[PDB]
Amino acid sequence: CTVKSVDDAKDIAGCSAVTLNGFTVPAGNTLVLNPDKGATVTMAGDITFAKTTLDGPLFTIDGTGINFVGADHIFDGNGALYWDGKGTNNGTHKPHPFLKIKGSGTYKKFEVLNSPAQAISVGPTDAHLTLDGITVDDFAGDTKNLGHNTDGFDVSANNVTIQNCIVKNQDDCIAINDGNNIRFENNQCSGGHGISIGSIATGKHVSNVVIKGNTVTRSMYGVRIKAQRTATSASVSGVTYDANTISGIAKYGVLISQSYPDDVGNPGTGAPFSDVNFTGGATTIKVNNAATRVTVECGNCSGNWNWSQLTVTGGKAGTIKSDKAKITGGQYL
Ligand SMILES: *[C@@H]1O[C@H](CO)[C@@H](O)[C@H](O)[C@H]1NC(C)=O
Ligand SMILES: *[C@@H]1O[C@H](CO)[C@@H](O)[C@H](O)[C@H]1NC(C)=O
Ligand SMILES: O=C(O)[C@H]1O[C@@H](O)[C@H](O)[C@@H](O)[C@H]1O
Ligand SMILES: [Cl-]
Numbered sequence: 001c002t003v004k005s006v007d008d009a010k011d012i013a014g015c016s017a018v019t020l021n022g023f024t025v026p027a028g029n030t031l032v033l034n035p036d037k038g039a040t041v042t043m044a045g046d047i048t049f050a051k052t053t054l055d056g057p058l059f060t061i062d063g064t065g066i067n068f069v070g071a072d073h074i075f076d077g078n079g080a081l082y083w084d085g086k087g088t089n090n091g092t093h094k095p096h097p098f099l100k101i102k103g104s105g106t107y108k109k110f111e112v113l114n115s116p117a118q119a120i121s122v123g124p125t126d127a128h129l130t131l132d133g134i135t136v137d138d139f140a141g142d143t144k145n146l147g148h149n150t151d152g153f154d155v156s157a158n159n160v161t162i163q164n165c166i167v168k169n170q171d172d173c174i175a176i177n178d179g180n181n182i183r184f185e186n187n188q189c190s191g192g193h194g195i196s197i198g199s200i201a202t203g204k205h206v207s208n209v210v211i212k213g214n215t216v217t218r219s220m221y222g223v224r225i226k227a228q229r230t231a232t233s234a235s236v237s238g239v240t241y242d243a244n245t246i247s248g249i250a251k252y253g254v255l256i257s258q259s260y261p262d263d264v265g266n267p268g269t270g271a272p273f274s275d276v277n278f279t280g281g282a283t284t285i286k287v288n289n290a291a292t293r294v295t296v297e298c299g300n301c302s303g304n305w306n307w308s309q310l311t312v313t314g315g316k317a318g319t320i321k322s323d324k325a326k327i328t329g330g331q332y333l
């Protein structure tokens, strides 16, 4: 019931208590854990991934009701051996995602250090899944702007809570791409592209999202809802921003747009956005001098969007094209 190598990992069936020791995952291998239902998995060392040619995920854990106790240990992706400024768009192969977490349970207190590109992929789930007190430290990727597409958390799942986490990276802190009942609370995001829903692709539906209590600094965007211009049979519905404190934003404090991968222009109509609110505690956003405060670029948006608790200052005014939605309240124009 102690995993000391990639081959030990296949031998944990029957273990209600697994200890994950530190070791290196050699080139050409992956670490896959399928723990027993309700098992506790406790990390007792750091896991380092030698430079590899495999596609990600390099680490996959999949189980029901798992209790993962990280004890502040590290999954080290050796990302600087791969980073070339091009991420997953071109250039060197980047194993991605680094980690994949599937099923359900509670995952606490570990660090992902220097992922090659996207760090933690979440989903699908079979019950609630909570990630609590995880650090994605890709800060080294800022050097010479070589880290790219280093998303903290990519979520395509239902019934997820991500709380008390820290992300230092070069792309979305979180990107919520699909699923219902997703809560992102009391996290700290710096260096990247902010807190995102999307990009929303054809057939994907994000609903009942709560973005609460987070701090975002030194980022390209504060919060975004982005849908591919071309997406159809897609939607975002029921999003509440509450109590977020954001500053140091370079491009847009808020960008809600159906023109992706562009920020604005000829927005699509097949990924309707509805019921997007800034309520509860104040969401205060300070943007840089050349930044835009708030832009909404809808081809198809509906509802009474209560933005009473949003305050955005700095930079210049954006544009509001909200289609059928009525945006009330707040301070940003
Ligand atoms: C990738 O970069 C190479 C040059 O470094 C360029 O030839 C190629 O067209 C780029 N990839 C794509 C898909 O455009
Ligand atoms: C998981 O999500 C789906 C849709 O949100 C739902 O039917 C199921 O009730 C949720 N389960 C739990 C345990 O929250
Ligand atoms: O934030 C974004 O949407 C985009 O940022 C760009 O810098 C990146 O090259 C894209 O792949 C996408 O991640
Ligand atoms: Cl290899």
Ligand code: NA
Binding pocket: 121, 122, 154, 155, 156, 177
């Ligand atoms: Na995803």
